[PDB]
Amino acid sequence: SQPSVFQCKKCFQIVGDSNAWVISHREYLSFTLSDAVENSVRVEDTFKRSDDGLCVYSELSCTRCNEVIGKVYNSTPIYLDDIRDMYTFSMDKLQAYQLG
Amino acid sequence: ESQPSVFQCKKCFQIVGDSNAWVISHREYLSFTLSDAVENSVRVEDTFKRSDDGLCVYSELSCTRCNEVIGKVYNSTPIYLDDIRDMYTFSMDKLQAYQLGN
Ligand SMILES: [Zn+2]
Ligand SMILES: [Zn+2]
């Protein structure tokens, strides 16, 4: 119906919204946007590996509370290309507000 | 560009409402006014006070999280300000806007 905005559950800093949505994965309790507020988010230095060894990602932090709230996938197999270099956030670390 | 904004208390970032409940706003008071806000986002203080020009009566609005005074509810007005009355009138100096992307 009506779009949503998304915030860190700790400090409430808005990290982006529905209109940059790409896909979600209830499997991993994640969701993925194509865009996000530059200043409210930080991609960390270290490349790290999915639990199944197959992907590489950098952690995402909220620039206000420094919680790790997501990941940016840098290396993927074919089938996870839609995620790659997108902002992939953890549902448990975020809150949605819908506009009504 | 036809895209909504969302509003938050500058201090804690609690969202208090959005553009879709918009009503009117006033450049000379650096304020804006909404017909709705998030249910538990906001507290009306029980003191009743007067505009600088003696004319209206408002109670202060506080952010239930950060206790900051962020606005007011005009309880009593003349005819012309009947738009404002019993509506959430926010202080632009104390709020923040986030306009969504496309
Ligand atoms: Zn945060
Ligand atoms: Zn606040």
From Swiss-Prot, chain A:
UniProt subcellular location: Cytoplasm; Nucleus; Chromosome, Centromere; Chromosome, Centromere, Kinetochore
Residues involved in Zn(2+) binding: C8, C11, C62, C65
Example of a GO cellular component annotation carried by this entry: nucleus
Chief localisation class: cytoplasm
Annotated keywords: Cell cycle, Cell division, Centromere, Chromosome, Cytoplasm, Kinetochore, Metal-binding, Mitosis, Nucleus, Zinc
Effect of Y73A: Loss of function
Result, substituting Y97 to A/E: Abolishes self-association. Loss of function
Gene Ontology BP terms: cell division; CENP-A containing chromatin assembly; chromosome segregation
Domain Mis18 residue range list: 3-99
Keyword Nucleus (UniProt): yes
Assembly and binders: Homotetramer. Component of the CENP-A recruiting complex composed of at least mis16, mis19, mis19 and mis20.
Function of the protein: Component of the CENP-A recruiting complex that ensures the integrity of mitotic spindles through maintenance of kinetochore factors mis6/CENP-I and cnp1/CENP-A. Maintains the deacetylated state of histones specifically in the central core of the centromeres.
Similarity comment text for this entry: Belongs to the mis18 family.
Protein name: Kinetochore protein mis18
Part of the full-length chain shown: 18 to 117 of 194
